[PDB]
Amino acid sequence: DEVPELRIEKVKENIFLHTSYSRVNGFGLVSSNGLVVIDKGNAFIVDTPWSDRDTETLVHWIRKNGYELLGSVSTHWHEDRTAGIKWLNDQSISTYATTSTNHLLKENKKEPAKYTLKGNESTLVDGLIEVFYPGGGHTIDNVVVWLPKSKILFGGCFVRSLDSEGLGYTGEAHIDQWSRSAQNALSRYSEAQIVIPGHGKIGDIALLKHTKSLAETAS
């Protein structure tokens, strides 16, 4: 039952990928991705690590390097996105999630984010971070995060890696809608140079085209 420690690796200027793990029944050890976004001495977390231990490590790294931590946002309700919300809340670090995500956390007896993002589109940190709802896919609540300054789309678990043979855990998925939702994201984010999936290797807009195709054949 050992798991690796969190690691933090640079994607490009001002953008860091955090990778953490959990052992999940039926899947074994699973790697999970989130980001730290830096701008003008401030930091913002996109999805928490998958444990308290790793959330603490990440926050310590941010503070060690002199950055002001403005908070976290989670891109859907499952534990690989939200495990550290309680830890962040208890340490007085602002946590954010959408109305739908916070509703689903409460329904499943989980600690909700302190702040709620309303509507299909939201803006964080004075335009640095844009949150967009493409439609149902992996879950009904899934959102993507666009970083206009970096030309990065963080897809979360709405986007699959290129080596993925399937859509992953589909127990709560909207498979028919997912292909259309993926097209919505493709049409909106033509500028995207880098796309980051919730699990697996980063790439370009090809990840969205592959995800779209996977959804089409899963139907």
Select from 35, 43, 62, 157 the one that contacts Cl ion (CB under 5 A).
157
Establish if 49 lies at the interface with Zn ion (CB under 5 A). no
Nearer to Zn ion, 78 or 212 (CB): 78
Angle, CA of 95, 96 and 97, to the nearest 5°: 135
How far apart CA 206 and CA 210 sit, in angstroms, is 6
Distance CA 212, CA 46 (A): 23
Q: Are 212 and 164 in contact (CB under 8 A)?
A: no
Residue in the block written with tokens 């953490």: 20
195 touching Cl ion, by CB under 5 A: no
Question: Of residues 67-96, which lie at the interface with Cl ion (CB under 5 A)?
Answer: 78, 80
Distance CA 138, CA 66 (A): 36
- Residue 171: count of CB within 10 angstroms of its CB: 6
80 among annotated binding-site residues: yes
Question: Is 113 a binder of Zn ion (CB under 5 A)?
Answer: no
Question: Annotated binding residue at 76?
Answer: yes
Our finding on whether 78 is near Zn ion (CB under 5 A) is yes
Q: Is 18 in the site for Cl ion (CB under 5 A)?
A: no
CB of 199 to Cl ion, least distance (A): 4
* Partner interacting with residue 1 (select from Zn ion, Cl ion, none; CB below 5-8 Å by kind): none
- x-or-dash string of contact with Zn ion, 141-170, rule CB under 5 A: ----------------x-------------
Polymer length of the chain = 219
Rounded to 10°, the helix 206-218/175-188 angle is 160
Q: Which residues are annotated as a binding site for Zn(2+)?
A: 76, 78, 80, 138, 157, 199
Q: Which residues bind Cl ion (CB under 5 A)?
A: 2, 11, 78, 80, 100, 157, 165, 168, 199
